[PDB]
Amino acid sequence: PSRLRKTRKLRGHVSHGHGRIGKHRKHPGGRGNAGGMHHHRINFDKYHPGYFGKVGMRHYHLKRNQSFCPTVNLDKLWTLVSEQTRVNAAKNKTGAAPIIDVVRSGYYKVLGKGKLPKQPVIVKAKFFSRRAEEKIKGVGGACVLVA
Amino acid sequence: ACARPLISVYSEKGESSGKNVTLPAVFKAPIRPDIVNFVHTNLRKNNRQPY
Amino acid sequence: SAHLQWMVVRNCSSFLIKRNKQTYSTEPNNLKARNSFRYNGLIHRKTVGVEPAADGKGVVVVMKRRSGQRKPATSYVRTTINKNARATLSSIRHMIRKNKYHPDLRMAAIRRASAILRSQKPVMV
Amino acid sequence: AALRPLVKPKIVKKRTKKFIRHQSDRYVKIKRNWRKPRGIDNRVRRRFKGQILMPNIGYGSNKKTKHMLPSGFRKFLVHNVKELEVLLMCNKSYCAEIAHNVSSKNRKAIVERAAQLAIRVTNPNARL
Amino acid sequence: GVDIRHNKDRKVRRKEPKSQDIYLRLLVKLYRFLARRTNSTFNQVVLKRLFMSRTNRPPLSLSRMIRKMKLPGREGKTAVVVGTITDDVRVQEVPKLKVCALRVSSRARSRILKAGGKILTFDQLALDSPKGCGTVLLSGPRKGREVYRHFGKAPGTPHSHTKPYVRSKGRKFERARGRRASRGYKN
Amino acid sequence: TKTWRRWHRRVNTTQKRYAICSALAASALPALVMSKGHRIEEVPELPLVVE
């Protein structure tokens, strides 16, 4: 809204809020990212370190599908299954230990972040972390690998 | 869950008949003139032809 | 409630009137014609209104029943008083004070009735 | 035998002369409407002695008599009889001013109603 | 003729909320009256927090509220949060609580009501304890936003761990001259 | 003036539902209806349900 914009309060002011000693010239400093090495080096080195120079190996035909691998932590693992599944756990005097399919929920790798409740569970996933496997074993479950 | 009164149904010639309806909670929903005005002013810009 | 609708209506009312720094409200049953929370007949559960008589002599007192809202047809009850310019004021005073029906509006309604009665008489030479 | 105000305080004004634009006398294209001088070398802007006076907040009139007519009432612009009845409880301090566009036929009725309600009109005998 | 610097004579603290919603303004009126009448500073703190903007009252998580109520001493006390209470999915055991907040998420509300807890609004809290007796005042992490990760000492400065503004993190967008020891220098 | 000015505005579905619910709720409360200029003095009941 031009009504709420600043230009309405600048009516009558000669310089229109852009100084009068140095006028608002068209492009005093250079267009765009001009002078990354010259006359803007201080800014480019104190606000964008690592802008200039190459590093690493080139990969011509890169595909994100090959490296696609979503991760889920043990911090939020029972959220993938219904709450009644966990209700029917630590009960029945049988040791049901239900199966939670991570791939069905939409993750491939299971990570060890977070605390796991004391309830056995069968975790099926493509990849497992060492700490996540240790947590599952300590809780009393089993890690299952799937393709 | 506020108290919902009973709304009588009026016939074609007034003279409210015996039919009554429990007042829906939509009428007990909170009033927000700011939200109403915001939505109205933003949606009035959708039927505007370019010039 | 009343505060909710007052917050809704304090500035977007059709009866609100600006234009030379005085804000009034023209909705009925509003003593002193003041756009104030206390002086507003639409929002409050108990409202008193003083109006000139349709015939031209006497005054009309309008009371909000509070028995049932959402029914504007029967919400307000009107009574006509045509007495000797002092019994009307006494009747309004007893209506507002003895019934404990919005005592804040007592003197305002008395003044409005006095103004109406003064208006309904021969004007001048 | 007009309508007296409720109170008649002594209206005191700090300044009554209108503020005029700088160099409004020299040129016709410059109106009397005041605009603040915004030049680097301007006597009025920096308040040199003997120049025109720049309006300031100091010239603000007293709140007691602000917007008060010499008669002692405050104007309220009335367009029709329905709007006239609003001033019923404010007749002792507010006066009805009939809108210019109002026809004479309705103006007469407005004047008569205001006379009945004891509300002062600043332009009662205007159209005729 | 007095030398007084008017640079900071005007205090910039808020006086009324900038929001135009009516329920918050009614709560503001109620707590203004309570603060100006009662001698308790709880009402004043609640009024000041109601005046605060959205970013100044971050939401409080259910797990954080649980861990703050589990501290010894605040047993059977009502929790007062001026922000909003949000459900936490990584917590299973939720004891019953007494929570006062402007808003509660649907999931958190369901959890609290299923656990046997009670949820109150600010007007109900004023009716119950006008001076805020038996209340535990809690708030969310102010520095929880990712905005504050970009604040502080600028990147490219020694002993600075500030996240720079990058269009997209990657191999060839940063970690070059200025960050690699093999390319120029590093900080 | 150019044709590709951002004429249209996007509003959240939840916000639109909130606004319409508030409008339906304020359809009650005869004070607001009268203040909106609608003359409902003789209406038997503001939630006017007909057969």
Added chain:
Amino acid sequence: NFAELKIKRLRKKFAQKMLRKARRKLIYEKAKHYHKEYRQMYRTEIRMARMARKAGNFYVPAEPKLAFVIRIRGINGVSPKVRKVLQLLRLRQIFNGTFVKLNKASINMLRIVEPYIAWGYPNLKSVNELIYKRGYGKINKKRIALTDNALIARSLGKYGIICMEDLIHEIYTVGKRFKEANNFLWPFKLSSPRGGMKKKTTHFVEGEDAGNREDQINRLIRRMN
């Protein structure tokens, strides 16, 4: 219930009246004691002087414990250190006076701002007139006139100062709470010196008004206050 409540209210009012009468009596007794103490001090100084002059001896009077300082020049073109000392002495506006107790640090500060101030040793009448005619207290960071002793009692009750007489005594005979009394006292906005000045820009010794004018500061107070 009604009569019992009325009787209790009357009893409380009577107790308040008796307490106020007792406080008034205490104020009267304190003022009379202060009068006696002032007379004793004035008489004993002359007694010591006469005693010293009786034999081949001299009596050197004590250096004054407090001094009155008035800023005589404006705020335009002031050195940073001079301005800092002036604003530490609560002398911001021209023709403002403030009581300052004298010690090494105070004398050094007054020496630093010597060209910008005129200071001396105020008399008892000068203190009385300054406290009475132009005495304002700082209550809730607000300059409020000392129209009644209630304000002084509320502000300096913890220090044994409950009236104008106690305040004047603590200001004149520098005591333990002189700092608190002087900080409570708002700086005196004295008027322009009637009859003019000799010279603002030069020291008092060389015909000007700036510097130390120990006894003539009383004349300056009479011309300004």
Added chain:
RNA sequence: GGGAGCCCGCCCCCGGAGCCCCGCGGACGCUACGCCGCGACGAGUAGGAGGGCCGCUGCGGUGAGCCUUGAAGCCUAGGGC
């Protein structure tokens, strides 16, 4: 509640004690984005911010708005804010 004091009993309620405080109900003051009371201060280019019941145009609502018994516009040695 018990024991008693410089023969016993009351020592009462505002639909009325009549008021410089009445905790029984409470404005002429309450457009609480309102009203009211104290102090201190008021320079200003470049520049920033806030309030405009300042002004122009068109749109959605609203004034049972104005108007051929005279609209906008224009002129004015008239009354004004």
Added chain:
RNA sequence: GACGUCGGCUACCCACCCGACCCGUCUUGAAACACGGACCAAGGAGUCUAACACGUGCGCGAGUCGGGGGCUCGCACGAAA
């Protein structure tokens, strides 16, 4: 004091005393022997799109979203909802 007498601060003309150099801009410095300028009327210059950063308001909340498409209408209001 009341049928040629009253009040009109403001605006019409005139006289007197004091003050008072022509506006905008570059400039440390403008009344300048620095530049633009006879006068008047109309037009006239910080906009829009996209990408960001911060702050504020609203909705939902470890979730959030409508991009695109489809189902309701013959489009008055709708290319809306």
Added chain:
RNA sequence: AGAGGGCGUGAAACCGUUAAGAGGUAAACGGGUGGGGUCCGCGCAGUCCGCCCGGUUCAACCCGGCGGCGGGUCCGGCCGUGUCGGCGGGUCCCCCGACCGGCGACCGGCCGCCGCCGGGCGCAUUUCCACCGCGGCGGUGCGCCGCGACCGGCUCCGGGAC
């Protein structure tokens, strides 16, 4: 045609004419007055009123009717929130019994109060209209003024006493 064929409204620069005023330091401007005109608001005194007090009917009090407000024994029935119960049909529905919040979510009787209408109430009450009191209160005076007492802020003067 005060719309007369480039003719609706007809402004400013500029010009001609009528009326008034003025005019040897170019003109013009700000502050303060004075003089003359333009009309404006008064008056053929403007002593502005608004309450209380003194010198044709009904309130007061009853009868009948109607309407309204408040209240509790929750009186009786609905309504309605939290819990307990019939498991009666994870979230969503009915019954009687109990407690609590009895919540402005509604009614039927009861009481108290108020208002209106119709009857009595004929005149020490009642209300109007006008006057002689400037008697009590409040804001005010049509214009020009004068005086008195109190206070605050100042410049002074005459005394006495240490």
